[PDB]
Amino acid sequence: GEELFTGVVPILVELDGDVNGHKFSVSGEGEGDATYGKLTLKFICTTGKLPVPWPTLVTTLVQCFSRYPDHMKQHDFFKSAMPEGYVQERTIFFKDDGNYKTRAEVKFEGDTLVNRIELKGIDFKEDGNILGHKLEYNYNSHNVYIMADKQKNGIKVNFKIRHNIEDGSVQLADHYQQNTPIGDGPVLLPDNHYLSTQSALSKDPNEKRDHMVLLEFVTAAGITKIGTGFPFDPHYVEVLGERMHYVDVGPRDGTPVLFLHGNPTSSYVWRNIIPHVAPTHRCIAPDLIGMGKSDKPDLGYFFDDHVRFMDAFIEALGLEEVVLVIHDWGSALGFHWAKRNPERVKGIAFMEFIRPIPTWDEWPEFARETFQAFRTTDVGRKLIIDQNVFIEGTLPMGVVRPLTEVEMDHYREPFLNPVDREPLWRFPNELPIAGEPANIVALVEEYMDWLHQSPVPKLLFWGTPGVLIPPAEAARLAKSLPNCKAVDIGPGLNLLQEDNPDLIGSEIARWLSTLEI
Ligand SMILES: [Cl-]
């Protein structure tokens, strides 16, 4: 069943409803892509005007399209029931108002995933939030809690939807849900876990009928708390006539620890790692030029531009010796600086770092087509600059766990204006993949050669399946690099700091205590 979801799947939804005697029908069409947990659908009220608010129908109107992480695939009941499908039953209690009772069958009909529903609503107030149409046309993010019902060979599901009301209040809709397979075959019965959801509601400007356009992303989580705050005072330094922002905490003496982020992040990516190190060592975490809270001049934002500014940042702070903690393009900066200043580097901690990627075969299959499209002057700028895909989509797809709205808004803040998105597009176009661009390939080969000969203490973090660093490569490097300790962080893609910050931070702290600094 799970193999039926490896690509984009067309969806059809049909709803027959009756709420307080008002009969109506809704039809929907679109597609789902479980790789991304994604649904893109358009729903039409085929009987006229919808007698209830469109948001009240979102949960009723295909959880088999949820993004289940690799390490949780044995917990995905929904896909395991396919193609024969499952019955989905709910009662939805609208607080201080009526209730919906729904029964749906979700199954494949040919190549199409179909959700057919009957809905009955009763006991609603004619002047309440639902029949009075007092709900805002928007939708919140929720946790959907799933447990097995071993006796009934299905699952029990519970969650509370928060509907924003036009007077600023919130109307709760308490969801009680049961799913049972239609077929007679066995299914996966999961351990307790949850789905983290988000939904975006919009309108079709050319559609005359009452309708709803829906974009939804859902990732499963909860099988094996992470701070969202950024409690660091801003520090600024003039670098090459531009102001760069940096975190600066911990004791003033000793060897400083320099944390370098990559694409599309900022010093925010280090927020839950720095507190493990600050007790014993100075922590300096700059925002790269063009990113975070640093100034954003009109540059090409080639790697060489970042080299120039980071060189000058390090000198501006008068750093002499450093320990480097580096990630993604921050690792290219850190390694390239170490190669040129080996006497000044007392240790390198690194993770998901820039290495020569010899063939596209080594790039994750699920992200291969998108990064190839990023690496163009037309389509790639449309995606990254015009549509902000690297922030809105590639960033969440580089983290195994769900990124919360607060965390997303921290990552979004530097790039609300499309003109400032140049570094987000130039960075993937600098990645050394399949020999191009040759100048980056040559630079990265040089610092990898240096790394293989240098005695500097090394700490390598890696996760499964990773993105830049497959687990087999991390293992090979741990065995071949001198004075290298390797730490498996568990599940992870690219931003390993977001999937296991406590292990990364505590192991850096312990490793620092073993250095002769
Ligand atoms: Cl990149």
Please state whether the peptide bond connecting residue 83 to the residue before it is cis, i.e. omega within 30 degrees of 0: yes
Whole-number Å distance, alpha carbon 348 to ligand 1 midpoint, is 21
The edge-to-edge listing of strands for the beta sheet with 322-328 is 235-239, 242-249, 283-286, 257-260, 322-328, 345-353, 458-465, 484-492
Q: Please state, in angstroms and rounded to a whole number, the distance separating the CA atoms of residues 447 and 369.
A: 28
The DSSP secondary structure of 258-286, one letter per residue, reads EEE--TT--GGGGTTTHHHHTTTS-EEEE
Whole-number Å distance, alpha carbon 428 to ligand 1 midpoint, is 4
Query: By what method was this entry solved?
Result: X-ray
Please state whether the peptide bond connecting residue 264 to the residue before it is cis, i.e. omega within 30 degrees of 0: yes
Whole-number Å distance, alpha carbon 427 to ligand 1 midpoint, is 4
Whole-number Å distance, alpha carbon 30 to ligand 1 midpoint, is 31
Strand-pair partners of 219: 67, 196
Q: Which residue has the tokens 């006991």?
A: 123
Whole-number Å distance, alpha carbon 360 to ligand 1 midpoint, is 15
Whole-number Å distance, alpha carbon 509 to ligand 1 midpoint, is 28
| Tally of CB atoms within 10 A around 18 | 14
Q: Residue 135 gets which letter from DSSP?
A: B
Q: Which residue has the tokens 């690792």?
A: 331
Give the CA-trace dihedral at 230, 318, 347, 280, to 10 degrees.
-50
Instruction: Please give the single-letter amino acid code of residue 284.
Output: I
* Residue 280 belongs to domain with CATH number: 3.40.50.1820
Q: Could you list the residue range(s) of the whole structural domain that residue 335 is in? A: 236-515
Whole-number Å distance, alpha carbon 180 to ligand 1 midpoint, is 43
Question: Are 326 and 355 a contacting pair, CB within 8 Å?
Answer: no
Whole-number Å distance, alpha carbon 47 to ligand 1 midpoint, is 48
Q: Please state, in angstroms and rounded to a whole number, the distance separating the CA atoms of residues 241 and 394.
A: 32
Whole-number Å distance, alpha carbon 504 to ligand 1 midpoint, is 22
| Tally of CB atoms within 10 A around 310 | 22
Whole-number Å distance, alpha carbon 328 to ligand 1 midpoint, is 7
Residue numbers after which the chain is interrupted (C to N above 2.5 A) read 61, 224
Whole-number Å distance, alpha carbon 102 to ligand 1 midpoint, is 45
**3-state secondary structure at position 222:** coil
Q: Please state, in angstroms and rounded to a whole number, the distance separating the CA atoms of residues 342 and 330.
A: 17
Question: Are 196 and 221 a contacting pair, CB within 8 Å?
Answer: yes
C-alpha 453 chain-centroid distance: 36
- Resolution limit in angstroms? 1.8
**Nearest alpha-carbon partner for 191 in 149, 159, 161, 136:** 149
- The number of residues making up the chain comes to 517
Whole-number Å distance, alpha carbon 303 to ligand 1 midpoint, is 11
Q: Which two tokens stand for residue 398?
A: 């580089």
